[PDB]
Amino acid sequence: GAMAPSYRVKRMDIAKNDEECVVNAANPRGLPGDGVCKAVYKKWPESFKNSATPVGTAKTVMCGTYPVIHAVGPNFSNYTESEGDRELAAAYREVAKEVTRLGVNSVAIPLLSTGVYSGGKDRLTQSLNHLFTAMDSTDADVVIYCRDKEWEKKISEAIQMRT
């Protein structure tokens, strides 16, 4: 565990993280994909051997000794708001299980279903709150990665609102 487990946010490519493992915003078929998933494919391609896993689940594959946790959030273009919300919560619960099992002291995590799986809606708060629900009972240092300047401010404010 971390000595004083924390939440932080950084605005940069998750492929350049300084944590002991990474969560991929994966597709269910283990394809290279786009966005976070393509950056992860370019950085850790070995981790996509048998990474295919259903929506709402997480599957870890080692790149050397570095764990890549493939977490499959729902595509809100296909799911109802209700079913998508349930699967998005489930995917983060499976990330907390894997982080715990691996015994890491830190993890880099993107906000699942907020990019091309968002169904064209702003899901910062919905996705972040499911991340907190899952990760709050873990003792890893969590570092959230984003790319947008206003998202960085809103994520930083939500973290600070606790503490």
List residues forming the annotated binding site for ADP-D-ribose: 13, 27, 35, 115-117
The residue behind tokens 């992860």 is: 40
Identified binder of Cl ion from the candidate list 1, 6, 12, 54, rule CB under 5 A: 12
At residue 66, what is the residue type?
Y
Nearer to Cl ion, 28 or 115 (CB): 115
Residue whose CB is nearest to Cl ion in the complex, by number: 115
Binding mask 110-149 for Cl ion (x = CB under 5 A): -----x-x----------------------------xxx-
Angle subtended at Cα 57 by Cα 53 and Cα 59, rounded to the nearest 5 degrees:
60
151 near Cl ion (CB under 5 A):
yes
* Assigned token pair, 44: 């850790």
Q: Rg of the chain's alpha carbons, rounded to an integer?
A: 14
How many residues touch Cl ion under the rule CB under 5 A: the total is 8
Find, among 19, 89, 16, 102, the residue nearest to 59 by Cα.
Answer: 102
Closer of 62 and 121 to Cl ion (Cβ): 121
- For the record, the structure tokens of 98 come out as 């894997």
The residues that touch Cl ion, with contacts defined as CB under 5 A, are 12-13, 115, 117, 146-148, 151
